[PDB]
Swiss-Prot record:
It comes from the Eukaryota. Residues 7-114 form the Bromo domain. The chain holds residues 1081 to 1312 of 2442 of the full protein. The modification N6-acetyllysine is found at residue 138. This is CREB-binding protein. Acetylates histones, giving a specific tag for transcriptional activation. Mediates acetylation of histone H3 at 'Lys-18' and 'Lys-27' (H3K18ac and H3K27ac, respectively). Also acetylates non-histone proteins, like DDX21, FBL, IRF2, MAFG, NCOA3, POLR1E/PAF53 and FOXO1. Binds specifically to phosphorylated CREB and enhances its transcriptional activity toward cAMP-responsive genes. Acts as a coactivator of ALX1. Acts as a circadian transcriptional coactivator which enhances the activity of the circadian transcriptional activators: NPAS2-BMAL1 and CLOCK-BMAL1 heterodimers. It comes from Homo sapiens (Human). It is linked to Chromosomal aberrations involving CREBBP may be a cause of acute myeloid leukemias. Translocation t(8;16)(p11;p13) with KAT6A; translocation t(11;16)(q23;p13.3) with KMT2A/MLL1; translocation t(10;16)(q22;p13) with KAT6B. KAT6A-CREBBP may induce leukemia by inhibiting RUNX1-mediated transcription. It is found in: Cytoplasm; Nucleus. Changing residue 192 to K: In RSTS1; abolishes acetyltransferase activity. Residues 84-102 are annotated as: Interaction with ASF1A. The KIX domain mediates binding to HIV-1 Tat. Found in a complex containing NCOA2; NCOA3; IKKA; IKKB and IKBKG. Probably part of a complex with HIF1A and EP300. Interacts with GATA1; the interaction results in acetylation and enhancement of transcriptional activity of GATA1. Interacts with MAF and ZCCHC12. Interacts with DAXX; the interaction is dependent on CBP sumoylation and results in suppression of the transcriptional activity via recruitment of HDAC2 to DAXX. Interacts with phosphorylated CREB1. Interacts with CITED4 (C-terminal region). Interacts (via the TAZ-type 1 domain) with HIF1A. Methylation of the KIX domain by CARM1 blocks association with CREB. This results in the blockade of CREB signaling, and in activation of apoptotic response. Residues 46-92 are annotated as: Interaction with histone.
Amino acid sequence: GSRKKIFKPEELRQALMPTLEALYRQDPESLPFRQPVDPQLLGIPDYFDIVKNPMDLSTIKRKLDTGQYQEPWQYVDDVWLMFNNAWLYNRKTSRVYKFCSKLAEVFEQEIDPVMQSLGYCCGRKYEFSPQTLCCYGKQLCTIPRDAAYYSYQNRYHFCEKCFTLGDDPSQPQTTISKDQFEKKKNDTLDPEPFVDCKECGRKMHQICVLHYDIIWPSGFVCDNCL
Ligand SMILES: C[C@@H]1CC(=O)Nc2cccc(-c3ccc4c(c3)c(-c3cnn(C)c3)nn4C)c2N1
Ligand code: NA
Ligand SMILES: [Zn+2]
Ligand SMILES: [Zn+2]
Ligand SMILES: [Zn+2]
């Protein structure tokens, strides 16, 4: 009897379908996304080499219609899987890529009040900005958002101007082949991390619900469960 919130299918369908309809309403931008990708019909036979888990509006609608989502973040995840597949497969200059970006703008403007009506802090999946990275070359030096840099193992980073590795003064350093590195751009957004309400079990964002002047020695409890 731990007060876990169980979402019934009709609750999720009634709340979330208007956000899906807002995407469907976009003409022309929803047109590439209204049906499952058919690589042979479209003439893109390499599609499933790149996209391992396809997703589209019709599949999301069917999942809502048949109760396949236990909680609304799974719906949010499917919407972003659809977007991320298209941003990966298609070139930035292509119409499908640009249409995807329009759909994502619409979704971000629709999802927060809907998720709030379901008891959540908001519906935003990703952090607002790429995290600032540390540059190994200098001590002061850091890599800001949208900056170019080099990275081995997604661990050790050098800004391009600075570009014998170690992560601690006592750690014996190792020589790594320069240009074993990959050049990257600091433009990736990570998912906003969660904390679960210990009563209802809802996943809430740490940044949304945990404040600099509040402690939770016995565990986080959301506003509606207090
Ligand atoms: C998401 C899916 C697969 C994908 O990642 N890239 C892709 C490449 C070529 C065509 C389409 C595609 C498929 C179906 C489509 C369309 C495009 C369009 C369409 C309408 N206007 N424009 C520019 C494309 N309508 N339909 C039903 C497409 N989209
Ligand atoms: Na265009
Ligand atoms: Zn939030
Ligand atoms: Zn540097
Ligand atoms: Zn709660």
